């Protein structure tokens, strides 16, 4: 669970790029505190 | 749009921007209601003139247009619908003629006078550099 | 200096001889610099007929031979 | 006091938008830090900061 | 005196026509009901001259929720000196 | 407050609008759990209180409408505020009960024709075409006491 | 001829027969999109058929992206199954075709100028706004797009049969004004 705040997410029906700012990322027991994150995900 | 209907009927024409910036109606409903006027015209019943006006503001001799007109005629007939709103390639007819002659009017000056993005200028110029071989009149 | 905006929209220098024949008006435009201010470049305003042989006319100081070229009697 | 930039490149499984909350659950996703973390289970919960 | 314009008639006309460029010089460019009702009951009681739109502006609640909130424990007057006041 | 509880209960009773047990009345709004509201119901007409079983009502026909229209003879003019609440869709009854069976005062066709107290013999009398009404307007009623002679001139 | 219109877009309407909580639908369904203040309908999609749905809280479901009656019907049924999976008493009923978009290519360039001039009653044309011509057939009441590239796009039909009839009646026009 990445409890962050979004800024601008761009998508054309098959892909996600999730802008994240002033939030945290929780992976492998180490928290990732980031200024700006862009989740360039893909949609099935 | 009545002026457009007027001026076109007056056997001249100006680009939409020259009128859209003259009268800003957001250009969307403007053209949409403009089209039905032709249908009403038909119910109640063209770049060829854009040539000399374009070279007019830049002050050149008279032989450019027909030389440009010959080039303008050749593009559409074989292929190259070229524009989808082909108003863009009206200038493309002209620029490959100013590229011919040595007067420096590079797309910097055309881009501020005729107001065409070099994305359209350079793309249209080079795809017309492919077929310029059959374009040697004199 | 005098000129004429023709039907298409082209604007070229007008010569007095042409003016009489083509029923034109031997005029020239006026242009004013305008300064706009918001408180808490060059602007065309109109034409102006020009007296023939005035200081601004093309015939202002032309040569006698040049006048013959322009088909205007000295 | 945040300087890291993250670029999560993976495969989104589920998403949802309610109360302007975006919940992006990516499976087998790679997040690029500034080293890239190929993390399987990630749930991007995006809330409106505006 | 007047400075003659040697620049050709077209180029002096260039800026004066439709060059498709403007603005070169900047000049005249031109929800929950009970909580809202709790907000409305608080806003009306705490401030007698609490605007319904002001309640939407103060509580940061939607106008639909703020207006419906006033109909329960607040006074909505639309005429007279006490116009748009929740008490 | 004492008045706020009575106001909320009255609106809640209006919101309920049905005769139910007084015990359920308190739990519907979770406010009228004190004897103040029950006493207010007996003392105020906003909430109907009676010695019978738990029931709160409002404190209905064109026949009643006509009698109510006749109830305002040589008096002030009433509105249909009670008529439409005491009989929903009372404006339709005016249209159905034509020929003075239900007169009204149609203010305009933008405010649901807010009617007033009116009684009439004919009421509508639509069969007389506007052509007769136009000639009634086209003929202007003439001037002063020459007219008794004028009707005498016509033979009256 | 021998060229059949190729259906492009089918827009339909589906009534689930029960009210839906679009928040719960968006959360539970793995493939669903919903913005409360942009458009109050869940954009739920599946890949087989690859369709877009307008799932409303009132139960109205507008299925688009399909290219046939049966594909739209199956997409609607799958969406209804997704709805009933949560616990809403949805029912796949009142399925109705709203718009059928078909396309075809006569493969030869057309004289659009003569087509517009001769068919002011039937053809809608403005080459500067869109170099394609809009043809409005009355029987069937189908809208047809005509291009120089030979592509013909027919849209808005209640039946794909209407699209086929429109293209069969417009093919004489396409061949008549074919530039050779
Ligand atoms: Zn009188």
Swiss-Prot record, chain B:
GO molecular function, one term: RNA polymerase II general transcription initiation factor activity
Sequence repeat windows: 54-130
Coiled coil segments of this chain: none
Cell compartments where the protein resides: Nucleus
Gene Ontology annotations of biological process type: DNA-templated transcription initiation; RNA polymerase II preinitiation complex assembly; transcription open complex formation at RNA polymerase II promoter; transcriptional start site selection at RNA polymerase II promoter
Signal sequence, renumbered to the chain: none
The entry's keywords: Metal-binding, Nucleus, Repeat, Transcription, Transcription regulation, Zinc, Zinc-finger
Keyword Zinc in annotation: yes
RNA-binding keyword on record: no
Gene Ontology, cellular component aspect: nucleus; transcription preinitiation complex
Cystine crosslinks: none
Subunit (UniProt): Associates with TFIID-IIA (DA complex) to form TFIID-IIA-IIB (DAB-complex) which is then recognized by polymerase II.
Primary role: General factor that plays a major role in the activation of eukaryotic genes transcribed by RNA polymerase II.
Record family assignment: Belongs to the TFIIB family.
Note: Present with 6750 molecules/cell in log phase SD medium.
Protein name: Transcription initiation factor IIB
Organism: Saccharomyces cerevisiae (strain ATCC 204508 / S288c)
From Swiss-Prot, chain G:
Subcellular location: Nucleus
A GO MF term: RNA polymerase II-specific DNA-binding transcription factor binding
Sequence repeats mapped onto the chain: 7-83, 97-174
Keywords assigned by UniProt, alphabetized: DNA-binding, Nucleus, Repeat, Transcription
BP terms from Gene Ontology: DNA-templated transcription initiation; negative regulation of DNA-templated transcription; nucleolar large rRNA transcription by RNA polymerase I; positive regulation of transcription by RNA polymerase II; regulation of transcription by RNA polymerase III; RNA polymerase I preinitiation complex assembly; RNA polymerase II preinitiation complex assembly; RNA polymerase III preinitiation complex assembly
Chief place where the protein resides: nucleus
GO terms for cellular component: nucleoplasm; nucleus; protein-containing complex; transcription factor TFIIA complex; transcription factor TFIID complex; transcription factor TFIIIB complex; transcription regulator complex
Keyword rRNA processing on entry: no
Statement: the UniProt record of this protein carries the keyword DNA-binding: yes
Family: Belongs to the TBP family.
Subunit record text: Binds DNA as monomer. The 1.2 MDa TFIID complex is composed of TATA binding protein (TBP) and the 14 TBP-associated factors. One copy of each TAF1, TAF2, TAF3, TAF7, TAF8, TAF11, TAF13, two copies of each TAF4, TAF5, TAF6, TAF9, TAF10, TAF12, and three copies of TAF14. Interacts with TFC8.
Protein role: General transcription factor that functions at the core of the DNA-binding general transcription factor complex TFIID. Binding of TFIID to a promoter (with or without TATA element) is the initial step in preinitiation complex (PIC) formation. TFIID plays a key role in the regulation of gene expression by RNA polymerase II through different activities such as transcription activator interaction, core promoter recognition and selectivity, TFIIA and TFIIB interaction, chromatin modification (histone acetylation by TAF1), facilitation of DNA opening and initiation of transcription.
Protein name stated in the entry: TATA-box-binding protein
Organism: Saccharomyces cerevisiae (strain ATCC 204508 / S288c) (Baker's yeast)
């Amino acid at each position: 669970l990445m409890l962050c705040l979004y800024d601008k997410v761009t998508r054309t029906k098959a892909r996600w790029k999730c802008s994240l700012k002033d939030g945290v990322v929780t992976i492998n027991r180490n928290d990732y505190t980031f200024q700006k994150a862009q989740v360039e995900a893909e949609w099935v | 749009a009545s002026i457009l209907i007027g001026c076109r009927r007056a056997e001249v024409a100006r680009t939409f921007k020259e009128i859209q910036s003259l009268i800003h109606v957001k250009t969307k409903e403007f053209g949409k209601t403009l089209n039905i006027m032709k249908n009403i015209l038909r119910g109640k019943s063209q770049n060829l003139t854009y040539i000399p006006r374009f070279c007019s503001h830049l002050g050149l001799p008279m032989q450019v247009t027909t030389s440009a007109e010959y080039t303008a005629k050749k593009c559409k007939e074989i292929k190259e619908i070229a524009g989808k709103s082909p108003i863009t390639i009206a200038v493309v007819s002209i620029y490959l003629n100013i590229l011919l002659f040595q007067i420096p009017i590079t797309a910097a000056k055309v881009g501020q006078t005729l107001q065409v993005t070099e994305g359209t200028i350079k793309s249209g110029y080079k795809i017309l550099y492919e077929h310029r071989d059959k374009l040697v009149d004199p | 200096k005098p000129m004429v905006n023709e039907s298409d929209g082209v604007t070229h220098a007008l010569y007095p001889q042409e003016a009489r024949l083509r029923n034109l008006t031997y005029s020239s435009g006026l242009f004013v610099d305008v300064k706009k201010r918001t408180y808490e470049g060059k602007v065309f305003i109109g034409r102006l007929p020009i007296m023939l042989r005035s200081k601004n006319c093309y015939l202002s100081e032309a040569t006698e031979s040049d006048l013959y070229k322009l088909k205007e009697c000295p | 006091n945040t300087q890291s930039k993250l670029t999560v490149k993976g495969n989104l499984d589920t998403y949802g938008f309610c109360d302007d909350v975006w919940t992006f659950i990516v499976k087998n996703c790679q997040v690029t830090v500034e080293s890239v973390i190929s993390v399987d289970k990630l749930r991007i919960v995006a809330c409106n900061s505006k | 005196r007047i400075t003659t314009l040697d620049e050709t008639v077209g180029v002096t006309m260039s800026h004066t026509g439709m060059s498709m460029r403007s603005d070169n010089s900047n000049f005249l460019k031109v929800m929950p009901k009970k909580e809202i009702l709790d907000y409305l009951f608080k806003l009306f009681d705490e401030y007698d001259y609490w605007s319904l739109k002001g309640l939407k502006e103060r509580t940061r609640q939607p106008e639909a929720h703020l207006k419906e909130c006033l109909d329960k424990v607040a006074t909505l007057v639309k005429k007279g000196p006490y116009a748009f006041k929740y008490t | 407050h004492d008045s706020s509880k009575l106001l909320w209960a009255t609106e809640y009773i209006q919101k309920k609008g049905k005769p139910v047990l007084v015990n359920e009345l308190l739990d519907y709004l979770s406010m009228k759990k004190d004897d103040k509201v029950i006493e207010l119901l007996k003392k105020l007409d906003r909430i109907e209180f009676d010695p019978k079983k738990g029931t709160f009502k409002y404190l209905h026909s064109p026949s009643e409408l006509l009698k109510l229209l006749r109830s305002q003879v040589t008096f002030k003019g009433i509105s249909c505020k009670d008529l439409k609440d005491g009989w929903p869709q009372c404006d339709e009854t005016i249209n159905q009960l034509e020929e003075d069976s239900k007169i009204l005062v149609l203010r305009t066709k933008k405010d649901k024709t807010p009617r007033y107290v009116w009684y009439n013999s004919g009421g509508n009398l639509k069969c007389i075409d506007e052509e007769f009404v136009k000639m009634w307007e086209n003929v202007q009623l003439p001037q002063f006491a020459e007219l008794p002679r004028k009707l005498q001139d016509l033979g009256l | 001829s021998g060229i059949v219109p190729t259906l492009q877009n089918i827009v339909a309407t589906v009534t689930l027969g029960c009210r839906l909580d679009l928040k719960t639908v968006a959360l539970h369904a793995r493939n669903a999109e919903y913005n409360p203040k942009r458009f109050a309908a869940v954009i739920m999609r599946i890949r087989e058929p690859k369709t877009t749905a307008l799932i409303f809280a009132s139960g109205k479901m507008v299925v688009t992206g399909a290219k046939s009656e049966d594909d739209s019907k199956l997409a609607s049924r799958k969406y209804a199954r997704i709805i009933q999976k949560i616990g809403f008493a949805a029912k796949f009923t009142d399925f109705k075709i709203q718009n059928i978009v078909g396309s075809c290519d006569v493969k030869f360039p057309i004289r659009l100028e003569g087509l517009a001039f001769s068919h002011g009653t039937f053809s809608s044309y403005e080459p500067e706004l869109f170099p394609g011509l809009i043809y409005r057939m009355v029987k069937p009441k189908i809208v047809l797009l005509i291009f120089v590239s030979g592509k013909i796009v027919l849209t808005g039909a209640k039946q794909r049969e209407e699209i086929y009839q429109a293209f069969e009646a417009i093919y004489p026009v396409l061949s008549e004004f074919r530039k050779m």
